From a paper:
HCO3− is accumulated intracellularly by membrane-bound transporters and CO2-uptake complexes and diffuses through the selectively permeable carboxysome shell into the interior; it is then rapidly converted to shell-impermeable CO2 by the encapsulated zinc metalloenzyme, CA. In this study, we determined the homohexameric structure of [name] from H. neapolitanus and investigated how it is recruited into α-carboxysome shells composed of CsoS1A and CsoS4A shell proteins, as well as [name] encapsulation in the context of Rubisco.
To determine the structure of HnCsoSCA, we expressed HnCsoSCA fused with a N-terminal Twin-Strep tag and the B1 domain of Streptococcal Protein G (GB1) using Escherichia coli BL21(DE3). The overall oligomeric state of HnCsoSCA is a homohexamer, with D3 symmetry formed from a trimer-of-dimers, resembling the CyCsoSCA homolog. The monomer of HnCsoSCA showed good map densities for residues 48 to 514 of the native sequence with a short unresolved loop between residues 143 and 154 in the region connecting the N-terminal and catalytic domains. These trimerization interfaces are primarily hydrophobic in nature and are smaller than the dimerization interface at ~800 Å2. While this motif is present in our HnCsoSCA structure and forms part of the hexameric interface, HnCsoSCA has Pro87 instead of His155, precluding metal ion coordination.
Residue numbers in the entry:
A (entry chain A), B (entry chain A): 48 to 143, 154 to 514
The structure:
């Protein structure tokens, strides 16, 4: 078990430290609750619980959570909800140009990544791809990578208008394109149970669904606008057991083949014992041989220089993540980490500060009526994850708003409260048992904006 | 009672003929139902009902509506729903460049009108303003003229991108602007009961709400984009009793004063006995005196030539509608026509083919969860309008889709069925009594596209 020459050691250590700290903050709540349940409800109950909470979780608890526990029993569910919300707040607060130039040199003025809403793909940008979130990098996760065409088209139009009017990334005459990346996931160890649940854990079904959505988006962009407007499409598959990516190389015209791809597992295997420059040569030629391969991978021409450079950089970055997983877990995630191990249900736009693998179940929705199935899937997952142990389900309803648009924050807060009430009236049996805990938050759309808590009522 | 020299007589006759035909098609159903209720449920019930329907409504009825009526009683509610749907279909089927040049000469490359969702404002474009619906004219009605800023901003961005890329209306360097018109309504005879129900029938409240929304949209456009991007705003008030408009004249910088306006009632009064050219001179100077007036109407500078020409054309067009109302109803709508007299509830994008005053109650919504209050208001209105007489409430769920975007039609049909089910589960008491009848339809976003019925399940 040696180290790859291209591994980013200090970045790996930093990422591991952040992951460990956040997961520990979320996980230490349960032992504290178990200790609390053994404290008699005497006259010293409140003081003892408060000092124990200060010693364990680093914060105290509101007296309303403990004031009437002597007559109403231990308020373990309320303490759990409060502690989970505090852990999420602490994680976000603790988290809180070169990428644009690199994208421009590769021939793109904007990169749009649409991975699956699976929790195992949450850390796709900071861990698997090592791509920072910039003003021109977007991450819109959907269930089964089934991203919506209309909003992507609107984003494309907005970016093109910005290029035409101000040329913020670059002037409109530059021959750069809009890059849309679709990410599917699969499990090598358990293909039939640990795959994409949106497609019945069928690897090829997820692959073809993502490819079809990419093709539909490209054709919609072509149809909606004239003068030969077009976009570039990229397809990436992630093995959730080893966090290794296979990138489907487009041909000269940009079409993607489900069989023409570069797999980073064999690349890591065959570049382990070489030297940095030689490994870079290896991946540079390997992209070419994969793109020029025949048979089922028959492709017309070869991909552009920018495409190949971008894919090579992606593979080099993913090598560090493969090495990170090998170091931390001996080459494969533990059996508990292979499946669902989420700590809370994220509803709305999600958090850009806690992009950690298998931390939360994300349900991209603006209305419960439109995407109820995501909420039901999350509740079903947490029924086994949490309700089996008797713990309540924590739900963070987070939304982003644009401060430039007048009245946007109030509308966003109203939307958050509406979502909270809709999730309340559904699963009303779980509500009556206090098995659902909520926290509502809003944030400005700018990167690094503070997160503001809002009252549930 | 003489005729205004500027009245468009043949256009008035044509409009009156269409209004009469559509309203008669909708209204003749009830007498037919009353005749049907007197037919004994013998062996000749089906044949007699079918021949009566052919003689009266011009179409037959499905046998399933009448096959089991002998044991289940008269199916008057089902026949009512079917006949109302057929009447709407007949009206739409019967309904089924110069404007762009006129807009360009006035300095606008796109006109966006956002009237109140009141049924009395339904015929605002073809009757009150005489403005045809073109590829660059949009009509987005909202309750209380409370139009949404985000979609308007998206439409502005799309239009500007089209100008920059292809210059379909005109090239981007042309000094034209995007024109946004907000229309509020008021009642002269019954100000406190027949005003804007979204603002408690308060005229000044509706005026200031519309003005505030226009100002918010202008400031949002200014903030979201640099290089001094801006839009033009116009405010119009409509007296639903006489269909007369007062247009608030902007000053040199485009700001609007709630007190600086030209009223078309006094204009019609003072131009009745003059000649066409003299009347045109009168309205041309009247715009100037109103815009230069002082006191509460103090404004900085005078409006541009294009603005004044557009407002003058609007007033000249509205003169014909004032004359039309004077001819048909003796100067004021009948007391039954002053209030609510709608025939069905339109849910979704509405119909561009039946723009007739007080024909339908429109509820602009994509989700019942988001805009439930519109549905409740419509149900409350039709409880007095229809449920008092024992008739069911007819609801047309209509939506528009873009054929260019792949999979758009299927998504739209799914959305229509979802809306239908959501309205079904709400007001379930009305559903169980068969007091809600539905028809679901989709249409391509292009003007003049056919309307396609879809099954409720
Ligand atoms: Zn998935
Ligand atoms: Zn109104």
């Amino acid at each position: 078990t040696c180290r790859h020459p291209l591994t980013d050691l200090e970045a790996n250590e930093q990422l591991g430290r952040c992951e460990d700290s956040v997961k520990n903050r979320f996980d230490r709540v349960i032992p504290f609750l178990q200790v609390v349940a053994g404290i008699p409800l005497g006259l010293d109950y409140v003081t003892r619980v408060q000092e124990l909470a200060q010693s364990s979780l680093g914060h105290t608890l509101p007296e309303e959570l403990l004031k009437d526990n002597w007559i109403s029993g231990h308020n373990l569910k309320g303490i759990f909800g409060y502690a989970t919300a505090k852990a999420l707040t602490a994680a976000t607060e603790q988290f809180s140009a070169s990428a644009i130039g690199f994208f421009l040199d590769c021939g793109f003025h904007a990169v749009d990544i649409s991975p699956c809403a699976d929790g195992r793909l949450k850390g796709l940008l900071p861990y698997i791809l090592r791509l920072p979130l910039t003003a021109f990098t977007y991450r819109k996760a959907y269930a089964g990578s089934m991203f919506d065409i209309e909003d992507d088209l609107a984003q494309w139009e907005k970016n093109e208008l910005r290029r035409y009017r101000e040329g913020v990334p670059n002037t409109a005459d530059q021959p750069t394109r809009y890059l849309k990346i679709a990410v599917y996931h699969f499990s090598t160890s358990d293909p039939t149970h640990s795959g994409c649940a949106a497609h019945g854990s069928n690897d090829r079904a997820a692959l073809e669904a993502a490819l079809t959505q990419l093709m539909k988006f490209r054709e919609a962009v072509e149809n909606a606008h004239c003068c030969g407007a077009s976009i570039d499409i990229l397809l990436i598959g992630v093995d959730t057991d080893t966090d290794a990516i296979r990138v489907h190389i487009p041909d000269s015209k940009g079409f993607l083949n489900p069989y023409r791809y570069v797999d980073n597992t064999v690349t890591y295997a065959q570049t382990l014992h070489l030297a940095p420059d030689e490994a870079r040569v290896i991946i540079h030629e390997a992209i070419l041989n994969a793109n020029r391969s025949d048979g089922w991978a028959k492709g017309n021409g070869v991909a552009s220089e920018g495409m190949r450079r971008f894919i090579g950089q992606l593979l080099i970055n993913n090598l560090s993540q493969i090495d990170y997983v090998v170091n931390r877990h001996g080459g494969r995630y533990p059996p508990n980490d292979i499946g669902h191990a989420e700590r809370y249900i994220s509803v709305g736009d999600g958090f850009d500060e806690v992009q950690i693998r298998n931390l939360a179940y994300y349900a991209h929705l603006d209305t419960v009526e439109e995407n109820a199935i995501d909420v039901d899937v999350g509740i079903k997952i947490f029924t086994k994850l949490n309700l089996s142990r008797g713990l309540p389900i924590p739900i963070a309803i987070h939304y982003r708003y644009d401060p430039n648009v007048p009245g946007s924050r109030e509308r966003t807060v109203v939307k958050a409260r509406r979502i909270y009430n809709a999730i309340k009236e559904r699963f009303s049996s779980l509500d009556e048992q206090n098995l659902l805990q909520f926290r509502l938050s809003v944030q400005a759309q700018d990167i690094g904006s503070p997160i503001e808590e809002v009252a549930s009522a």
